[PDB]
Amino acid sequence: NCSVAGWILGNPECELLISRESWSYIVEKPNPENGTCYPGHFADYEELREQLSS
Amino acid sequence: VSSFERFEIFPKESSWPNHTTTGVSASCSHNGESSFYKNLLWLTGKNGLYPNLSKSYANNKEKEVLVLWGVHHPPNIGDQRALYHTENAYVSVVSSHYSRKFTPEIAKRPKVRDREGRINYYWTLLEPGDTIIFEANGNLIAPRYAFALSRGFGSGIINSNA
Amino acid sequence: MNTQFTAVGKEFNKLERRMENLNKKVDDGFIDIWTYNAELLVLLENERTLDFHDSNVK
Amino acid sequence: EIVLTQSPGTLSLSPGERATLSCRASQSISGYYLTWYQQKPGQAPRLLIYGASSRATGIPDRFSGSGSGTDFTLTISRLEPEDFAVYYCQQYGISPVITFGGGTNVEIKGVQLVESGGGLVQPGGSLRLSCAASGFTFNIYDMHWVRQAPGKGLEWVSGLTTGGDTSYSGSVRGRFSISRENAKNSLYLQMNNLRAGDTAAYFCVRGVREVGATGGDPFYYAMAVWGQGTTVTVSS
Ligand SMILES: *[C@@H]1O[C@H](CO)[C@@H](O[C@@H]2O[C@H](CO)[C@@H](O[C@@H]3O[C@H](CO)[C@@H](O)[C@H](O)[C@@H]3O)[C@H](O)[C@H]2NC(C)=O)[C@H](O)[C@H]1NC(C)=O
Ligand SMILES: *[C@@H]1O[C@H](CO)[C@@H](O[C@@H]2O[C@H](CO)[C@@H](O[C@@H]3O[C@H](CO)[C@@H](O)[C@H](O)[C@@H]3O)[C@H](O)[C@H]2NC(C)=O)[C@H](O)[C@H]1NC(C)=O
Ligand SMILES: *[C@@H]1O[C@H](CO)[C@@H](O[C@@H]2O[C@H](CO)[C@@H](O)[C@H](O)[C@H]2NC(C)=O)[C@H](O)[C@H]1NC(C)=O
Ligand SMILES: *[C@@H]1O[C@H](CO)[C@@H](O)[C@H](O)[C@H]1NC(C)=O
Ligand SMILES: *[C@@H]1O[C@H](CO)[C@@H](O)[C@H](O)[C@H]1NC(C)=O
């Protein structure tokens, strides 16, 4: 259910999963439920995703 | 365009009592008689009485919205003190996604269409559900009218003398 | 072909020259590829048409 | 716009004296809203003070004022026989209507415009005036036509902003009509249905810098400059 915001930042309902050290590809849904619990602009979402393509 | 139209987000009447609205300029003219852009407004004080502002809007129409505003740069200070009564400029045009502030001074510039002054123009889209706020100590151009729209696809632009 | 309900053109300022020389390179690339492939296709197809006729009479 | 009341319409005082003059209105009216003039009979008016405190160009320091709200005031630090004159009280209505005090005579005990066409008509008649400009940009400023009967309170006949919002008095409207030309650097006032109330000396007046232009002109919400005026009369 998580967003990338909820993934990277440490949203407690998102499993952090530090053991996931590297992987094949990223899986989301289109409409990620858990964005940021305290909202706020997140600039360069595009760029961070592209850098975290791989 | 899939839909496009013009509406009155903030009527000139009754939006800004506490700032004199009616001022225009002379290069902006109509049949050799002065004017200013229909969709927008100047604001200045009530006989040298500037209070500062915070105003807002969010969509009820459920269509997408297109919004315009301006940031005043006089060519001399006597305007700045006379109109707005602060050398400080600070505007904050705010949304959820976009937001930005503006803090200019006077920059002298050469005469262009008999103008040294400038107003830098700034704009954004606004979607349904989302709020815009304007906060300021003057040096503003405000919306009178705003552009209601849907998206469009695939049409575009031509330059042509044909 | 599939011809989209298309809008070709763009424009840029002079601080976008990455994107200008890009979009020029992009478009010229595409233009040349359609040009090359189609020109070869006219040549080849007309040859195969001549051979089709020659074949039929033979 | 509101009726004013000067205090006093004439006075007689000695040299080396102050002079307190109070121009007060019906309502309380906010204070960068008035300006203050003089005039010698025979001369056109001259600009002195604006917004109840602050001072015009080409000046001594002696005339200085105060007051706010309903009661505005101009005071004087020293009196001199060169000041022998009628002083005026001219305010920009929020209803865009200049309003006038009735002139205040100091008696002391022991660039330009040009008008065109002043003179006589028959009452109930018809006549036009023009004015013409010299050495500025008639583009910018909000203009005013003004009247004055001899040794009487002024009256503000008409004015127009450079974007077309007219303002007349309810009595004078319809009988007069204006039209402006910035490419010509000139102004027009066609007038009809003229009676003895129009028997008076008129003035063409350059007012207010609208918002925006290049220049070493600032603005007030006072006049910019007057003209020399001219007489107009009905008779038979
Ligand atoms: C992670 O995502 C879930 C699912 O979106 C979030 O839970 C849901 O959050 C909404 C927020 O509007 C809850 O609705 C609200 O409920 C409260 C009453 O608790 C009410 O005051 C609000 O007006 C609104 O109706 C919704 O009930 C809730 N559902 C569940 C199953 O929890 C959750 O908050 C997200 N957590 C984090 C850490 O991001
Ligand atoms: C809309 O476009 C027209 C055409 O460009 C504008 O009219 C032209 O504006 C130029 C501005 O330089 C005029 O030249 C100037 O004339 C004035 C005297 O009036 C002079 O002071 C300047 O030094 C310069 O020579 C030009 O005459 C004028 N031509 C016409 C036919 O109007 C017009 O201003 C534009 N209007 C708007 C609202 O954008
Ligand atoms: C992802 O979101 C769905 C929302 O559809 C969550 O579904 C809930 O699941 C719990 C049981 O785990 C039920 O009690 C709720 O009634 C369900 N709600 C709905 C709307 O179906 C799901 O739990 C979420 N999963 C994670 C891992 O966050
Ligand atoms: C103007 O300021 C007064 C302060 O007394 C306030 O009552 C009024 O609502 C204000 N109007 C606007 C449009 O801000
Ligand atoms: C206007 O800005 C000044 C600057 O500090 C502030 O003190 C004042 O409260 C502001 N007024 C309003 C109405 O925002």
Side-chain angles (χ1 to χ4, degrees):
Chain A
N1 297 25
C2 293
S3 66
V4 177
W7 180 68
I8 190 167
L9 296 170
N11 189 359
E13 293 292 329
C14 295
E15 296 293 327
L16 182 66
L17 300 170
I18 60 169
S19 179
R20 300 295 301 161
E21 186 176 2
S22 63
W23 60 90
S24 59
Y25 59 90
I26 298 167
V27 180
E28 297 177 357
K29 68 188 288 188
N31 293 317
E33 296 292 327
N34 289 116
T36 57
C37 44
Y38 183 90
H41 183 74
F42 186 79
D44 305 332
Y45 182 73
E46 290 81 357
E47 290 288 329
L48 186 61
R49 287 167 75 88
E50 183 61 24
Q51 290 173 355
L52 299 172
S53 177
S54 57
Chain B
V1 181
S2 56
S3 183
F4 180 72
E5 65 189 359
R6 184 178 182 274
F7 67 99
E8 195 175 9
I9 187 165
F10 292 165
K12 182 173 174 65
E13 62 188 1
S14 186
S15 299
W16 296 97
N18 294 14
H19 295 96
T20 304
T21 71
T22 60
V24 300
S25 181
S27 296
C28 303
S29 297
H30 182 70
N31 297 113
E33 183 175 1
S34 304
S35 175
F36 184 74
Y37 296 103
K38 298 294 291 184
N39 295 317
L40 296 172
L41 294 174
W42 202 268
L43 298 175
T44 187
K46 185 181 288 297
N47 300 100
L49 294 177
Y50 184 78
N52 3 345
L53 59 92
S54 178
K55 297 296 291 185
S56 74
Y57 181 81
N59 191 3
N60 58 358
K61 298 182 180 291
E62 295 178 353
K63 295 180 180 179
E64 286 186 355
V65 183
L66 177 65
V67 183
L68 285 74
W69 61 92
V71 176
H72 190 196
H73 297 77
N76 287 316
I77 188 164
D79 293 329
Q80 185 62 254
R81 294 181 180 177
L83 281 83
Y84 310 103
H85 300 284
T86 60
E87 294 178 354
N88 290 320
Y90 65 90
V91 178
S92 183
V93 183
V94 181
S95 74
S96 298
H97 295 170
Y98 183 75
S99 177
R100 183 173 177 185
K101 294 189 287 185
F102 293 98
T103 61
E105 297 293 326
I106 298 94
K108 186 175 184 293
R109 297 295 298 164
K111 292 181 180 179
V112 178
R113 294 178 63 87
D114 299 331
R115 297 289 181 274
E116 297 184 355
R118 297 291 186 275
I119 286 156
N120 289 331
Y121 292 175
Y122 293 94
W123 61 275
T124 188
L125 293 172
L126 182 62
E127 65 276 20
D130 194 72
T131 304
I132 187 165
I133 296 169
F134 294 94
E135 290 185 353
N137 66 347
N139 294 321
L140 178 62
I141 297 296
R144 192 177 170 177
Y145 295 90
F147 292 101
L149 60 92
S150 179
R151 302 290 291 164
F153 62 96
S155 179
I157 295 167
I158 291 170
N159 291 320
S160 64
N161 292 317
Chain C
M1 185 67 73
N2 49 356
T3 64
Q4 292 181 354
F5 182 73
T6 306
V8 172
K10 301 291 186 290
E11 66 179 8
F12 295 96
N13 68 15
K14 67 186 180 289
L15 279 74
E16 288 163 353
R17 299 292 302 284
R18 293 179 290 170
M19 300 298 100
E20 187 177 4
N21 194 1
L22 183 146
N23 194 0
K24 185 178 181 291
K25 186 176 179 181
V26 169
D27 292 332
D28 290 329
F30 287 110
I31 288 155
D32 290 330
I33 287 155
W34 291 107
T35 301
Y36 183 78
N37 290 319
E39 284 160 347
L40 294 172
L41 183 63
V42 172
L43 295 168
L44 292 173
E45 287 288 328
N46 294 331
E47 181 60 26
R48 298 293 296 157
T49 304
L50 292 172
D51 305 335
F52 181 72
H53 290 293
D54 191 5
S55 173
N56 291 311
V57 299
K58 184 172 175 68
Chain D
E1 178 57 27
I2 293 156
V3 176
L4 296 171
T5 303
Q6 288 173 342
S7 304
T10 182
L11 57 85
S12 178
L13 291 176
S14 296
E17 293 292 329
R18 291 182 182 176
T20 300
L21 280 76
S22 179
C23 188
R24 62 185 183 176
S26 185
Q27 191 56 261
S28 296
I29 52 169
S30 307
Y32 294 99
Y33 181 90
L34 173 59
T35 176
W36 292 99
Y37 299 96
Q38 72 186 355
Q39 183 174 1
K40 302 289 180 70
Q43 190 183 356
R46 186 174 173 88
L47 176 61
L48 297 169
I49 302 297
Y50 64 99
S53 296
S54 179
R55 191 169 182 93
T57 305
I59 46 88
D61 297 332
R62 65 186 71 196
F63 297 162
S64 294
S66 69
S68 178
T70 303
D71 50 354
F72 294 164
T73 304
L74 178 61
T75 62
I76 299 182
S77 296
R78 186 177 295 113
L79 185 151
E80 289 294 328
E82 291 82 0
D83 300 331
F84 179 79
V86 58
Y87 300 95
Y88 294 106
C89 176
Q90 304 193 352
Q91 292 184 354
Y92 287 174
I94 303 301
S95 66
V97 174
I98 309 174
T99 55
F100 290 158
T104 65
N105 289 313
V106 64
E107 184 175 2
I108 297 96
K109 293 173 72 172
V111 180
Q112 298 293 324
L113 296 174
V114 64
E115 295 82 359
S116 177
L120 183 61
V121 69
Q122 298 292 321
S126 292
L127 184 59
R128 186 177 60 76
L129 294 174
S130 289
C131 180
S134 70
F136 65 95
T137 180
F138 183 72
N139 289 311
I140 300 173
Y141 289 0
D142 181 347
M143 302 289 107
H144 298 280
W145 293 98
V146 174
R147 72 179 171 182
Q148 185 174 5
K152 298 294 184 181
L154 300 171
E155 188 173 1
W156 181 70
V157 295
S158 59
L160 175 71
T161 188
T162 62
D165 295 329
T166 305
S167 293
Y168 296 164
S169 70
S171 296
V172 178
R173 65 183 293 277
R175 292 187 288 113
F176 293 176
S177 65
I178 53 173
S179 66
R180 187 174 291 170
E181 290 186 353
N182 296 320
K184 190 173 176 181
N185 296 322
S186 297
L187 184 62
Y188 296 97
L189 178 65
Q190 183 70 48
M191 300 181 279
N192 297 319
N193 191 5
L194 298 169
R195 63 184 182 179
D198 298 329
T199 301
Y202 295 169
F203 293 96
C204 184
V205 188
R206 62 183 301 186
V208 181
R209 183 260 188 89
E210 194 69 25
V211 176
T214 303
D217 54 349
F219 72 100
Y220 299 151
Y221 289 169
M223 280 67 258
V225 179
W226 295 91
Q228 297 292 322
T230 185
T231 305
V232 176
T233 301
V234 297
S235 184
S236 294

